[PDB]
Structures are given as structure tokens and as C-alpha cells.
């Protein structure tokens with residue numbers, strides 16, 4: 181089942197500053213009170229991060245190119261954002277990865293889904309509307325896991341697809357800022373190392389409707405792209421990353 | 435010492451001759467797998483990471499995702515056991531230089547052995563800051579330095595005293 | 597600890613012996629340098645208990661009896677202001693004995709002038 | 717300007733950093749030598765007319 | 766910055782030691798920088814080539830370190846000879862030498 | 865082939881840096897002597913013979 185949503189209001193996507201966000205742990209190695217230089221796929225400091233809104237009539241679900249890696253920021257309340265879709269053509273011709281968290285449990289699937297042009301979730305005011313794909317023919321991997329999830333929550337994710345391994349780095353931050361991204365430092369811990377071995381070039385996030393037509397709950401998300409660069413990471417006495425330096429940002433950090 | 439200096443007569447002094455590389459006792463393989471032993475120099479194999487070191491209890495509180503531990507010089511000094519979720523420090527197996535303190539062979543053939551940076555409990559045995567000295571009788575009297583040992587310690591012949 | 601590596605390394609000859617000899621020469625040279633700089637007197641001179649030097653005060657350079665290291669306040673400040681096959685050999689002269697040598701030189705140059713450097 | 721050569725050169729580690737650091741030390745040492753030899757007075761004296 | 770001269774010597778020695786241990790993590794064109802990985806992953810006919818590459822790289826690093834240490838030791842020996850001269854001529858006597 | 869060129873050029877550069885450091889030590893000794901001569905011969909009268 182697919183439904184076209186035809187009550188959107190046309191508006192260009194916004195842009196804002198990344199500040200010092202998008203940092204993650206490059207490896208599984210504990211380090212204490214030391215500075216470590218890494219050449220990985222990182223998000224540049226103070227970069228131009230794309231801003232999308234869900235407000236009421238704005239319902240932003242475009243399909244974006246994956247590039248070499250994706251930083252996803254979510255200024256979220258009431259859990260509108262439920263998952264993501266990764267693939268190349270997003271149909272049954274190729275194989276696609278699906279990440280969802282519905283009302284009960286977290287499901288990770290790798291199938292050849294026949295995706296809708298406008299896929300979404302839906303909550304009736306209870307969640308009773310699932311319109312993501314019309315078919316799923318060749319499923320090669322299934323994985324059921326723990327629940328991952330004024331704006332009250334900052335949910336930061338980093339997705340990488342290197343050597344057939346899809347790395348999900350995650351961090352949850354209690355925030356109280358109303359509109360934009362908070363300015364601060366929070367290192368993203370690696371959450372899921374996923375053995376897919378498939379080509380990913382395009383992605384699309386999943387939102388949830390509110391029914392009483394449909395209403396979009398208040399949410400905002402940010403999309404940034406990773407580039408290969410070096411960061412200098414600082415590790416304190418407790419082994420928590422507290423600060424980082426972008427070596428290619430400005431001559432002082434160089 | 436005679437073999438090291440390529441001479442059958444050795445002058446008075448301290449001569450570094452060899453290294454005391456403690457040999458590994460057992461082999462421990464841990465997987466998420468034999469039993470784990472501690473406070474011994476063993477050949478460890480933690481999830482495909484092999485080496486030789488003493489595995490002791492650690493005070494480092496690891497984050498739940500981290501498994502290994504590195505120092506400034508990028509050497510693995512901490513590990514997490516896969517069977518039981520605990521943290522272990524790897525101290526490297528005891529090593530140091532082995533120096534021989536002797537007077538002239540014209541005078542005497544008695545020698546003393548200095549193990550540099552080696553505790554005396556894991557090797558006339560006296561513990562110095564320079565290392566463990568075996569074969570020299572420690573005295574409380576102070577004399578002029580004849581053969582330098584280090585850290586204010588000197589050796590002489592009168593038997594060999596330190 | 598690789599025995600195959602050592603067997604292959606023996607094919608290269610006495611490079612390791614040369615490097616160990618050079619490092620040993622540097623290590624004994626450092627002790628020789630300290631011996632040359634600080635041990636210029638064979639008599640340990642001591643200041644009188646009464647510090648009557650005609651109004652001259654040497655308390656900032658003489659050793660402090662209250663401190664366990666027996667260092668001067670200036671020397672204590674100087675020590676406060678300085679912050680796989682690898683071993684570090686300790687120096688032959690400890691900081692206490694180097695401080696004792698400087699104390700002996702200070703006592704000689706205070707109580708005897710330049711006479712202790714040229715004889716009795 | 718060969719990218720492949722630099723990629724292979726990265727396998728050898730921090731040799732280049734060592735060489736650059738040594739040359740930088742020599743370069744600052746020359747200036748220190750010139751300061752030590754010639755800059756021993758902080759007053760620029762001039763002869764009478 | 767009063768005691769910078771001693772601090773430079775301490776920093777240079779620690780930095781040289783740190784770089785010497787960091788050189789162990791480089792493979793020098795071999796498949797890996799760890800000998801145990803080569804012994805466990807390859808037969809001896811190719812393993813001898815891999816350890817030969819690691820041995821020549823590490824030997825070049827160690828020779829470079831020893832050469833730098835010898836040059837620094839010569840500099841420190843010159844400084845110590847100067848310090849001994851100052852101890853003899855300024856402390857143990859009164860010097861007429863200007864500055 | 866690039867590895868052979870890299871090791872040859874790196875050996876040449878390390879050799880050049882080694883003699884540069886040795887010459888730097890010699891020039892530093894000469895400069896220290898020159899500073900001593902500037903302090904003792906120009907800024908004062910020296911009793912030291914020759």
C-alpha cells in the first residue's frame with residue numbers, strides 16, 4: 181500500500197552550522213589521557229549541514245545521495261523519526277537495507293523491497309499505519325535488536341559503508357534548545373557493526389504521520405556528509421573523548 | 435664477559451653482557467577457550483590478538499564498546515576478557531640488561547650479576563634502584579666508588595661488596 | 597620474541613652490537629659529564645652552624661634542613677619547575693648527591709674563598 | 717606529484733617528519749648562532765661626528 | 766620559560782624515544798607491521814621476505830635514532846665541558862674573562 | 865620499482881641530513897668560539913695568550 185501526500189507546502193531546505201558535532205570513536209580501543217591522530221571519514225567542523233523540518237504544512241522526506249558517509253542529527257520529541265532506508269535504486273531490481281523501530285521492537289532487514297514513492301509511518305490519536313514497501317522478495321539478512329531511541333532529545337547517528345561493513349555510531353543527548361543545533365561536544369559511540377556487503381548510494385529517512393487527513397509532528401533533522409580527513413582526538417583520564425581538532429579547518433587547528 | 439669482550443683477561447669494571455628475557459610459562463587462549471591465569475608471564479591470545487605478557491587486574495573503567503587499550507606509543511597495554519566482562523592490564527614480561535661486575539682476573543675470578551630494572555623477587559641478593567644485584571654483599575659503610583653500579587650504588591672488592 | 601626473526605637478523609652481522617656499544621658509550625658519557633661538572637672537590641665542606649657572614653644572607657642557596665631532600669629553596673624550585681627492548685638506566689649520581697656536591701662547593705666558596713680550589 | 721609514490725611512502729612512517737624536524741633545528745640554530753655572536757649589546761652606540 | 770634549556774633536552778629525548786617506538790607500527794612495505802601475524806598467516810618462503818622488509822625498516826629506524834643520539838650526546842658533552850669550565854673558573858675562582 | 869626509488873632517495877636524504885647535522889655541530893662550535901672571542905677580545909682586554 182502506498183499513499184501520495186498532496187497537502188505539502190513548498191519551501192526550500194535550510195542550511196546551518198555543524199559546529200563541533202559529528203565526532204565518533206574511530207575504533208574499539210580504549211585510550212586514557214592521550215592525544216590520537218586518525219585519518220578516517222569525518223564530518224568537517226563548522227560545515228554547511230542541511231536542515232529539514234516537520235511542522236504544521238511541512239513534511240520533509242526527500243531521498244538524498246549517500247556519498248562516502250552520512251551524519252544524521254535529530255532534534256526530536258515524541259519519536260516521529262522511526263528509521264532509515266539505504267540502497268542504490270530503492271526497488272526490487274537491487275537490494276536495499278531497512279532500519280525500523282516501530283512501537284514494539286527494532287528490526288533490521290536486507291531485502292529487495294518495492295518501496296513506495298512516499299513511504300511513512302502513522303500513529304492514530306496508537307500506531308496503526310505502516311506504508312514503507314509493497315513487496316519484499318529476496319531477503320538475505322534479518323537482525324532484531326534493542327530499542328535505539330520544545331525539542332527535548334538530540335539523537336546523533338553516523339552511517340559508514342566501508343569494506344561491506346555498515347557502521348552505525350550513535351549518541352543520545354538531553355537538550356533543551358528550541359530550534360537549532362546546540363553548540364557543544366558529544367562523541368558518538370559505535371552502536372551496530374552490520375555485515376551487509378551491498379552497494380549503497382542513496383538513502384531516505386522515515387517519518388510518522390498523526391491522524392485525527394494527516395498531521396506532521398514537530399521534528400527536525402540535519403544531514404551532513406563525511407569526507408576523508410584527520411582529526412586529533414583527546415582522551416581524558418576516564419577514556420571519554422572530550423575534545424577534537426580538525427587538522428584541515430584553520431591554520432590554528434593545523 | 436670473556437666471550438663478550440673477546441679477551442681471556444677482563445679488567446676491573448662493570449660490563450654489560452646479555453639480556454634477561456623472562457620466558458613465557460603457559461599459553462592462554464580466550465574467545466567469546468582455556469582457563470585464564472593471572473600474575474604470570476604467558477602467551478596471551480585475546481580474540482585473535484596474540485602476544486606475551488603478564489595479565490593483571492585493571493582499574494581502568496572501559497566503555498562497553500571498547501575492547502583493547504593503548505598507551506601513548508600505540509602498544510596494547512589493556513584488554514577486555516571475552517568470557518567474563520572484566521578488564522586486564524598487560525604488563526610486558528620482565529626484561530633488562532645483564533651486566534657482570536668483576537675485578538681484574540689477575541686479582542680474582544669472583545663476579546656479581548646486575549639485572550637492570552628487574553625486581554629481586556621474580557628473578558647475596560640485594561635490591562637496588564638500578565636493578566637486582568646477585569653475588570654482592572651489601573654493607574652499611576660508605577667508601578669511594580670503585581665500580582659504578584648506579585643510583586648511588588657502587589661495588590668494590592675487599593669478596594665483592596656493594 | 598620471534599626466533600625466525602633473530603635467525604634472519606644474524607645474517608646482517610654485528611649491527612646490533614655496534615648500536616648497543618654506541619648507546620653504552622653515550623650512557624657512560626653522561627655519568628662522566630656529571631662527574632666532571634659537579635665532582636670537582638674531594639672534600640665535603642660544611643658551613644658553620646652560626647651564619648655570621650657580615651650581613652650576607654645565603655639562605656636561598658644553602659641547603660634547607662627542614663626539607664628531606666636537603667636542597668636549597670632555589671634548587672627545590674628548579675626541581676619543581678622541570679616536569680619493546682627499551683630501558684632507562686639511572687644516573688650514577690642521584691639528585692641528593694649532586695645537591696651535596698653543590699652544597700660542598702658553596703660551603704668552600706663561602707668559608708674559604710678560592711683557596712679550596714687551589715689546595716687546602 | 718605522484719600520488720601512488722606518496723601512498724607507498726606512507727608505509728615507512730615518520731621518517732619525513734624526522735628529517736624536517738632536524739633541518740628546522742639546524743635552521744633555528746643558525747639564527748641562534750648569529751644572535752649569540754653579534755647581538756651582545758642592547759644599546760646601538762654611535763660615533764661622534 | 767626560565768628553564769627552557771633543560772626542558773628542550775628532555776623533550777627532544779622523549780620525542781626521539783616516542784618516534785622510535787612509533788616506527789614499530791610501520792610495515793615498511795610488508796603486509797603487516799606485526800611479526801606474529803606474518804608467522805601465522807604465511808609459509809616460511811614468503812615469511813622470510815616479509816621479515817626481511819620489517820628487519821631492514823626497523824634497523825634503518827634504529828640506526829637513525831642512534832645517530833641522532835650520538836649527535837645530541839656530542840652537543841651535551843660540549844655543553845657539559847663548558848659547564849665544568851664555568852664551575853672551575855667562576856665558582857672556584859674569580860675570572861677576568863668578560864661575559 | 866617505486867619502492868626501490870623511494871628507498872634509494874630516502875637513504876640519500878637521510879645521509880644528507882646526517883652530514884648537515886655534523887656540519888651544524890661544527891659550525892655551532894665555531895660560532896661559540898666566535899662569541900667567546902667577541903666577548904673577551906672586543907668587549908674587554910684578554911690576558912689569554914694567542
Ligand SMILES: *[C@@H]1O[C@H](CO)[C@@H](O[C@@H]2O[C@H](CO)[C@@H](O)[C@H](O)[C@H]2NC(C)=O)[C@H](O)[C@H]1NC(C)=O
Nearest residue numbers: 181182183184185186295296297298299311314
Ligand atoms: C505517488 O506518486 C508517485 C510519483 O508520481 C507515483 O509514482 C509513479 O508510479 C507510476 C505507476 O503507475 C509510474 O508510471 C510513474 O513513473 C511513477 N513516477 C515516478 C516519478 O517514478 C506513485 O505511484 C504514487 N503512488 C500511488 C499509490 O499511486
Ligand SMILES: *[C@@H]1O[C@H](CO)[C@@H](O[C@@H]2O[C@H](CO)[C@@H](O)[C@H](O)[C@H]2NC(C)=O)[C@H](O)[C@H]1NC(C)=O
Nearest residue numbers: 646647648649651652653654655656657660669
Ligand atoms: C636571611 O634571609 C631569609 C630569607 O630571605 C630570612 O628568613 C625570613 O625571616 C623573616 C623574619 O624572621 C620571615 O618573616 C621570613 O618568612 C623568612 N623567610 C624565609 C624564606 O624563611 C632570614 O631571617 C635572613 N637572615 C638570617 C640571619 O638568616
Ligand SMILES: *[C@@H]1O[C@H](CO)[C@@H](O)[C@H](O)[C@H]1NC(C)=O
Nearest residue numbers: 194195196197226227228229
Ligand atoms: C550553505 O549552502 C547554501 C546553498 O547550498 C548557501 O546558500 C549557504 O550560504 C551555505 N552556508 C554557508 C555557511 O556556507
Ligand SMILES: *[C@@H]1O[C@H](CO)[C@@H](O)[C@H](O)[C@H]1NC(C)=O
Nearest residue numbers: 267268269378379380381382
Ligand atoms: C554502486 O552504485 C552506483 C550507482 O548505483 C554505481 O555507479 C557503482 O558502479 C556501483 N558500484 C558497484 C561496486 O556496484
Ligand SMILES: *[C@@H]1O[C@H](CO)[C@@H](O)[C@H](O)[C@H]1NC(C)=O
Nearest residue numbers: 280281282283284285287307
Ligand atoms: C513491528 O514490526 C515487526 C516486524 O514485522 C512486527 O512483527 C511487529 O508486530 C510490529 N509491531 C507492531 C505494533 O505492529
Ligand SMILES: *[C@@H]1O[C@H](CO)[C@@H](O)[C@H](O)[C@H]1NC(C)=O
Nearest residue numbers: 272273292316317318319320
Ligand atoms: C530475486 O527475486 C526474484 C523474484 O522474486 C527471483 O526471480 C530471483 O531469482 C531472486 N534472486 C535471488 C538471487 O534470490
Ligand SMILES: *[C@@H]1O[C@H](CO)[C@@H](O)[C@H](O)[C@H]1NC(C)=O
Nearest residue numbers: 415416417418419420422495
Ligand atoms: C573521571 O571520573 C571521576 C570519577 O571516577 C570523576 O570524579 C572525574 O571528574 C571524571 N573526569 C572528568 C574529566 O569528567
